Amino acid sequence: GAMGSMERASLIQKAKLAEQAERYEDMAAFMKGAVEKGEELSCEERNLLSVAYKNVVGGQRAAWRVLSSIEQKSNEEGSEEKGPEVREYREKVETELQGVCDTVLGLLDSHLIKEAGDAESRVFYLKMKGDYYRYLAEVATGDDKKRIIDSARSAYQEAMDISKKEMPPTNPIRLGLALNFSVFHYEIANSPEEAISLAKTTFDEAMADLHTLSEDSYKDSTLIMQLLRDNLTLWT
Amino acid sequence: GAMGSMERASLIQKAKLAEQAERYEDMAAFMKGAVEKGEELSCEERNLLSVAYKNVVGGQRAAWRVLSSIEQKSNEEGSEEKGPEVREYREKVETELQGVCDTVLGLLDSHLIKEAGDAESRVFYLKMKGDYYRYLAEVATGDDKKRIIDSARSAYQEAMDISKKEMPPTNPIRLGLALNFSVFHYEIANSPEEAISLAKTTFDEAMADLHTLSEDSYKDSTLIMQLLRDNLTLWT
């Protein structure tokens, strides 16, 4: 790996610089190098890893949606034949997106998840596993689409089971997991009622636990609760 | 070149798709491939080339400025020694920026400028040559900084000489050239009075020619005139 000669601490320092410079591909490469040093990641380091790849894949997803929309309009009755270029370029972006997802899933499998014993780390990584399988599902169309969907579901479900046993209902990781699993239900699994039920129950159980929190924790939790509420407003 | 097997028309089509998807690195690679087919570029194609590279280098410049600011704060009295990482990463971004500038300058030299005979194409490419030498000057610190600055100045000056002979004072290419040369004077050449004089004269001569224009051309010209006015307001 091109980061193999750089100190772990230097990779983390440069990931933070890359974030400040909005250089998310660099940020992700630095964090991949840091993971590949083989040591577990601190909470701060896990968040750097997630921010970097979420930004990279987010740009790819947005581009893929633009191109997929153009491609779909091209196959509508009365559209002129423009040749293979739209499909080819959509496929190019798709393959790059899949490659990033495979890279993240590879880091999680080798060996972040298996060494993660604390609830906060294990839930974080299993949520990430669900997210990156979800991104693969968004572009899947062939035989394996059902298996990709089931992989996302299984990762999210294991994360949910741990989070419900080991974390309070206001914990921001637990809340973000529930948010993303509800989006999985709505957008991927064709289960809008499950999505709505999960978002509602998560919101209500968090609301009931806010009284236990400091001002700063209250701010953190209510921010994510508002995202649950925003989705409920859109979906109902 | 990786684009050598793709049809010219397909490269242009994909450049337009990449623009819609905000995939500017892809856009630039497609347009580089199109240039390397060896045919002259139409007005639309020249603008695709410029948009692509301006976006790529613009992101690099913004990142370089963030990192350079952090590096300068690190060398201020009482700042802790953080090691070589800030300098290293600033240098990495700088080298990538220089590489993009060298790529654009290489396309202009081989062989866009020498085949450009019409004023609109020749001025466009010489303005680009000035711009990319200007971006190199922004990061230059060694022996060649004076020579880089003079290369930018010479390209802009040749473009100005042609534009004044061959184009009306409201022509948007002429206006954008004057805008950028005035920025060169202010930011690069330590000549704020020259910058102000150029922006003022350009604005006033365009104003006097607006009466000759259609509604659509008037909109195009006045948009750039407002940019000249914005700089004058900042500089005076």
Return the CATH number at B145: 1.20.190.20
Smallest Cβ distance to A17: which of B14, B17, B89?
B89
- Tell me if B82 and A22 make a contact (CB, 8 A cut-off): no
Query: How far apart (Å, rounded) are the C-alpha atoms in residues B236 and A68?
Result: 49
DSSP output for B100-124: HHHHHHHHIIIIIHHH--SHHHHHH
Q: Is B10 on the interface with A (CB under 8 A)?
A: yes
Distance (Å, rounded) from C-alpha B178 to C-alpha B228? Answer: 9
For residue B94, being part of any structural domain is answered with: yes
Give dist(CA B180, CA B16) in Å, integer.
Answer: 25
Record: contact A82-B13, CB cut-off 8 A: yes
Query: Hey, is B176 helix, strand or coil?
Result: helix
User: A181, A160 in Cβ contact below 8 A?
Assistant: yes
Rounded to whole angstroms, how far apart are CA atoms A105 and B46? 41
- Residue numbers in A near B82 (CB within 8 A): 13
Residues B4, B18: Cα–Cα separation, whole Å: 18
- Give the domain extent around B187: 8-236
Is there a domain that residue B86 lies in? Answer: yes
A83 CA: distance to closest CA in chain B (Å): 9
Residue at B3 is within a domain: no
Q: Is residue B2 in some structural domain? A: no
CA distances from B156 to A232, B56, B197 (A): 57, 21, 16
Looking at the domain assignment, is residue B93 inside a domain?
A: yes
Q: What is the maximum alpha-carbon separation in chain B?
A: 62
Task: Quickly tell me which residue has 């880091």 as its tokens.
Answer: A107
Q: Does residue B215 lie in a domain region? A: yes
For B88, the token pair is 């290293």
Return the residue in A7, A10, A20, A89 with the most chain B beta carbons within 10 A, the one to mutate for interface testing. A89
Burial class (CB in 10 A: 0-12, 13-18, 19+), B130: buried
Environment class of A46 (CB within 10 Å of its CB; exposed 0-12, middle 13-18, buried 19+): buried
Please give the Cα distance from A64 to A93 (Å, whole number). Answer: 6
Helix (H, G, I), strand (E, B) or coil at B167: coil
> Which residues of A fall within a CB distance of 8 Å from B14?
85, 88-89
With CB atoms and an 8 Å threshold, state whether B63 touches A88: no
Contact criterion met (CB below 8 Å) for B197 and B229: no
Task: Specify if A124 maps to a domain.
Answer: yes
> Which tokens is A206 given?
């968090």
Residues in contact with A195: Cβ distance below 8 Å, sequence separation at least 6, in sequence order: A182, A183, A184, A185, A186, A231, A235
* B-contacting residues in A 90-129 (Cβ below 8 Å): 92-93
Instruction: For CA atoms B126, B127, B132, B137, give the dihedral sign.
Output: positive
Give A-chain residues touching B88 at CB under 8 angstroms: 14
CA distance B77 to A163: 48
What is A97-118 written as a DSSP string? HHHHHHHHHHHIIIIIHHH--S
Per-position DSSP letters for B38-89, written without gaps between them: -PPPPHHHHHHHHHHHHHHHHHHHHHHHHHHHHHHHHTSTT-----SHHHHH
* Token pair for B186: 């202010």
Across the interface, whether the CB atoms of B17 and A62 are under 8 A apart is answered: no
Name the residue with tokens 């040559």: B129
Q: Which residues of B touch A92 (CB under 8 A)?
A: 26
For chain B, the domain total comes to 1
Distance of CA B6 to the CA centre of its chain: 27
Q: Could you give the maximum distance between any two Cα atoms of chain A, in Å? A: 62
8 A C-beta contact, residue A203 and residue A170: no
Distance CA B42, CA B46 (A): 6
- For residue A176, the distance in angstroms to the closest alpha carbon of chain B comes to 28
Cβ-proximal residues to A93 (8 Å cutoff; 6+ apart), any chain? A60, A63, A64, A67, B21, B23
Both structure tokens of B178: 């004057």
In a domain, B20, yes or no: yes
* Residue B110: Cβ within 10 Å count: 12
Hey, which residues 149-208 in chain A have their CB within 8 Å of chain B?
A: none
Q: Which of A10, A67, A89 sits opposite B85 (nearest CB)?
A: A10
